[PDB]
Amino acid sequence: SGFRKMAFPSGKVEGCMVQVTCGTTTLNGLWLDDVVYCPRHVICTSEDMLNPNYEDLLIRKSNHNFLVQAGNVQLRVIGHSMQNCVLKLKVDTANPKTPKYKFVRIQPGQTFSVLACYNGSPSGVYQCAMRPNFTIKGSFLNGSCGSVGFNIDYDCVSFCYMHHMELPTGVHAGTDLEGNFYGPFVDRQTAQAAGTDTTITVNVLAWLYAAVINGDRWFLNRFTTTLNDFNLVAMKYNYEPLTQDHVDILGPLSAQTGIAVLDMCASLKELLQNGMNGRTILGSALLEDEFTPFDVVRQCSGVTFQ
């Protein structure tokens, strides 16, 4: 038993990280096959950040302006293209450590593991969730951009995020592996507001099941509710509205514990209006929303990976 913020093993990703340099800027790139992907602002100088014309900037850059390294090994750039906000650097040497991967774009509420790196070298791994406002609350310092977020499906690494920037509020934003930002952000140094954030209701319910699985059942009650009646209370506390789909995804956890999802919603409803009254759930004094139903099943069922 037990329950922790568990991340995916990062072995498969560690072997794809490289160091990319252009001018005085050094950041990380993702080396898969014979391509190195990295944030396109790597070609900008501090003066260009205000209002960059990436197309024109890229046109003035030649393959030898890009120094790419993989430890000692220096890769040779054969070509450079730009896809959305991501830069693709064709290289002479293909990556032998290229795992079986794919690029996916996650949705708000879904979670993934982040391999924070600096100078192409791994620093740590942690789990986090894509917030409803499309930002993430990560832990990144200068030099971290190019670090990626990923998930694993047995033997397939799914890359879903590349780090690009930080907001004054302390949160982070980036794109998927096709270069499209998550959220309304653009890569230029201007004030850009992230929408209001909300609590990922489905995740909170999953965590509550996890607690029950782990013997913490004090918050359980005999009352019941309807999806409509629950949502009315939820929206008042800035919680995402719960949909029938959410209910279906929580089915497995409901099956395993014998507690209907609406019965669980009824307990959550009470907790929102009455608070936790000095008690904790799974060691926390706040309702945790960064565990998906799948994360709970995986951790409580012991799903492993090739």
Place this chain on the structure above:
Amino acid sequence: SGFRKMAFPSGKVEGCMVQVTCGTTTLNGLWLDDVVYCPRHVICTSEDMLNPNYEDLLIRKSNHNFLVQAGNVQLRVIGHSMQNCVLKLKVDTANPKTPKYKFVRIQPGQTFSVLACYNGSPSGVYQCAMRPNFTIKGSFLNGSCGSVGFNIDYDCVSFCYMHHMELPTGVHAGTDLEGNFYGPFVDRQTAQAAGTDTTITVNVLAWLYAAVINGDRWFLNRFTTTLNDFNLVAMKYNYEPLTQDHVDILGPLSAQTGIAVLDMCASLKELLQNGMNGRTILGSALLEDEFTPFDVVRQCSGVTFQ
């Protein structure tokens, strides 16, 4: 910026995990060089657990009673010895992926990363601390024993824990890599109490510095205290007493922020007696004690690994 429960990249450890079988028992082993280390209770049957005589049990076992696998690859056991509560299986094939390692025994309050595995396959990675009562609050299921805890020092993996069992309270216990349990536990199925647990004061102070580094400074005050006066309040709230050594280890964080350790103790003192009054620090409503001063520096300074 940002602050998360960060674990070490597990690449180097993933390649040392193997599956060990003996009779109807299958668990994980650690394959380094030509030795596979695993919990010695792998030779026991359910009936032997009550009061096992490991020496006699081991004597009745022959090298071919141990099936060891590394994916498809089947290793061949050439010999079997027992060191304390750990079993050493000499093998015909040495591990090519054997990293530059060493075995260390940590102290209460120190943290490490755990690579949870099942059937020799990795499941996830998470950070945790050795509690003052020598247990750990991990996340492990049946089949998890042999999973290890480790740290990394540039290019050297330091193994400091091997999982053996779980207490009814839900916490976990195991040994170091030389087979000595952490705590007063013995590997037999009998009631065995873990001592009273306490809060790792030095860690809490480190986390407070982390918060300051991250802009959360509301709890700061102009008062000051003495180590003796602080400790008197601390012991009342079941906090470990703070020693001059602790103070010295917190020096780097004090240097970086310009806040004396005793000034920080004075803020913590107030928080203990007055509470957080509906506020949070680094997103938490409780004082976190599973981050060492080093963990804070590493995460706030961006230390990486070969």
